[PDB]
Amino acid sequence: LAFGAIQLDGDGNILQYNAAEGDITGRDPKQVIGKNFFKDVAPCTDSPEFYGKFKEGVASGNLNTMFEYTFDYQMTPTKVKVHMKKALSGDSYWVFVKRV
Numbered sequence: 001l002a003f004g005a006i007q008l009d010g011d012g013n014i015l016q017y018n019a020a021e022g023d024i025t026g027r028d029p030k031q032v033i034g035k036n037f038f039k040d041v042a043p044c045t046d047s048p049e050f051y052g053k054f055k056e057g058v059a060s061g062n063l064n065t066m067f068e069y070t071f072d073y074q075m076t077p078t079k080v081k082v083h084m085k086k087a088l089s090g091d092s093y094w095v096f097v098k099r100v
């Protein structure tokens with residue numbers, strides 16, 4: 001696939017990936033459980049532009065934001081839009097990766 005759909009929790013753990021990250025990169029939807037997205041499966045991300053914005057909704061109350069971010073450090077320069085929103089199926093949020 002090409003569009004991404006990830007589930008991150010207010011701590012920083014990954015729940016479920018999509019068959020996009022596991023398609024080209026090689027991260028299956030079940031390989032990221034108990035894993036910190038921002039450090040263990042993407043150490044470029046824990047910063048004020050990605051992780052920071054993710055945390056802004058958490059720090060407030062509900063999370064629902066869409067910003068544009070680049071994936072590098074291991075991914076080739078991919079420009080995506082990160083639409084994160086709160087979930088209740090599991091204590092976490094649904095963060096969507098929209099590649100332009």
Ligand SMILES: *C(=O)/C=C/c1ccc(O)cc1
Nearest residue numbers: 021025042043044071073
């Ligand atoms: C920053 O370290 C980004 C890492 C990354 C982005 C996208 C992927 O599919 C895999 C790793």
